[PDB]
Amino acid sequence: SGPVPSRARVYTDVNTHRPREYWDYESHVVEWGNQDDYQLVRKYSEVFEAINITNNEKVVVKILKPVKKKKIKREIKILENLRGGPNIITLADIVKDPRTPALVFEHVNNTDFKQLYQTLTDYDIRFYMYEILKALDYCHSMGIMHRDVKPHNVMIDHEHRKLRLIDWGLAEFYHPGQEYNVRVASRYFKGPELLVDYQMYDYSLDMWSLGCMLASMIFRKEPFFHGHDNYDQLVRIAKVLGTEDLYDYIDKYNIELDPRFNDILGRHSRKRWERFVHSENQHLVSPEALDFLDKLLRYDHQSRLTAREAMEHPYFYTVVKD
């Protein structure tokens, strides 16, 4: 009879109460500079280190690929709307070749969370997770879902304990009732709502992704849900979260499940986190880390922690004391 509708547990109407201009990005007017203000220095897609040949300033220039003209306006609008926010990357300028569009960013000391968390201490993890949550709670509070949260999109300046949530090209504004594309995040980070094609999702989407990072980080298991396609991904999840909850979730929202799944999910218990623990990763695992982790990875998007809630978990007790 059709999927049950859903609302965001928080920041539900922040967009409704704002000026049309804020979220109506199709009508945004972009004004371009000439790239002849920048020289390309060095060069995993089309992005470069560059300088401003008028202020000798180091920048990063990201030449966009041919993509629907609205999606550019969207990314630009979202970047402007979030400029100045905690741990959000900073758009410096927008230029064309004198004619492909490029975004110019403040220079960050690049080290994606991947090439780093393979060496982090229990404390660092907590610390940077709190930094990501600062950035997630901000944009969520600002009516925005980053929809591609993953290590490759978190730049860390480990020397200066600095962090930036980057790459807002999949980001969208949250509007209660709207049905979004389920074809968004990276495979290993897609939330269940995406795998079962439930389009009325929200900011919660991001907390699943966060959950997937926290998991791979503490259990030292890169690709914690290592699916081989968008169907086997839900199977790898089921083998951990069990199928009973999965199915209650389907029922709760009256979700039509793809004919395919009928023959692969099967039956599965909800494994205990302890079964992922061992001598290599035990120093990162803790009763709180696991309590916290468990509250992120829920089939039901409504029952996941909000970013603000997460920041108030005992897992961060030590960090927030600063």
Residues known to be catalytic: 148
Contact yes or no for 142/82 (Cβ under 8 A): yes
Among 5, 3, 10, CA closest to 307? 10
Count of domains for the chain: 2
- Residue 27 is encoded by which pair of tokens? 């009508």
Instruction: Give the C-alpha separation, 103 to 113, whole Å.
Output: 22
60 is a domain residue: yes
- Chain position carrying tokens 């993890």: 125
Do residues 300 and 315 share a domain?
Answer: yes
1 is a domain residue: no
Among 308, 318, 313, 321, CA closest to 11? 308
Do residues 68 and 159 share a domain?
Answer: no
Which of 80, 107, 134 is at the close of a domain? 107
Do residues 167 and 46 share a domain?
Answer: no
Do residues 36 and 16 share a domain?
Answer: no
Q: Does 46 appear as a known binding residue?
A: yes
Count of beta carbons in the 10 Å neighbourhood of residue 248: 12
40 is a domain residue: yes
Do residues 11 and 31 share a domain?
Answer: no
Do residues 251 and 273 share a domain?
Answer: yes
Residue 8 backbone dihedrals phi, psi, to 5 degrees? -70, 130
Gapped junctions in the chain, after residues (C–N > 2.5 Å) = 43, 98
196 is a domain residue: yes
Give the list of residues 6+ apart from residue 295 with CB closer than 8 angstroms, or none.
Answer: 304, 305, 310, 313
CA 39 to chain centroid, in Å, comes to 31
199 is a domain residue: yes
Question: SS3 for 191?
Answer: coil
For the chain, the residue count is 322
Residue 106 backbone dihedrals phi, psi, to 5 degrees? -55, 145
Do residues 65 and 171 share a domain?
Answer: no
Do residues 120 and 269 share a domain?
Answer: yes
Do residues 79 and 201 share a domain?
Answer: no
DSSP state letters, 76-119: HHHHHHHTTSTTB--EEEEEE----EEEEEE-----BTHHHHTS
Strands across the sheet containing 38-42:
33-34, 91-96, 101-106, 57-63, 47-52, 38-42
Method of elucidation: X-ray
- Residue 22 is encoded by which pair of tokens? 């804020």
Give the list of residues 6+ apart from residue 114 with CB closer than 8 angstroms, or none.
Answer: 151, 152, 222
Contact yes or no for 97/35 (Cβ under 8 A): yes
- Chain position carrying tokens 């879902």: 145
Q: Does 62 appear as a known binding residue?
A: yes
HSE-CB for 147 with a 13 A CA cutoff: 23
Strand partners, 156: 163
Q: Does 231 appear as a known binding residue?
A: no
Q: Does 44 appear as a known binding residue?
A: yes
Among 262, 145, 268, 270, CA closest to 210? 145
Instruction: Give the C-alpha separation, 148 to 86, whole Å.
Output: 18
What is the CATH classification number for the domain harbouring 177? 1.10.510.10
Helix (H) or strand (E) segment spanning residue 318: helix 317-320
Do residues 135 and 270 share a domain?
Answer: yes
- Residue 197 is encoded by which pair of tokens? 């094609």
Count of beta carbons in the 10 Å neighbourhood of residue 14: 19
Residue type, 113: F
Find the domain containing 95 and state its range: 24-107
- What radius of gyration, in Å, describes the C-alpha atoms of the chain? 20
Do residues 168 and 312 share a domain?
Answer: yes
Question: SS3 for 38?
Answer: strand
Question: SS3 for 206?
Answer: helix
CA 292 to chain centroid, in Å, comes to 18
Contact yes or no for 210/296 (Cβ under 8 A): yes
Q: What is the resolution of this structure in A?
A: 3.0
150 DSSP 8-state letter: S
Do residues 165 and 38 share a domain?
Answer: no
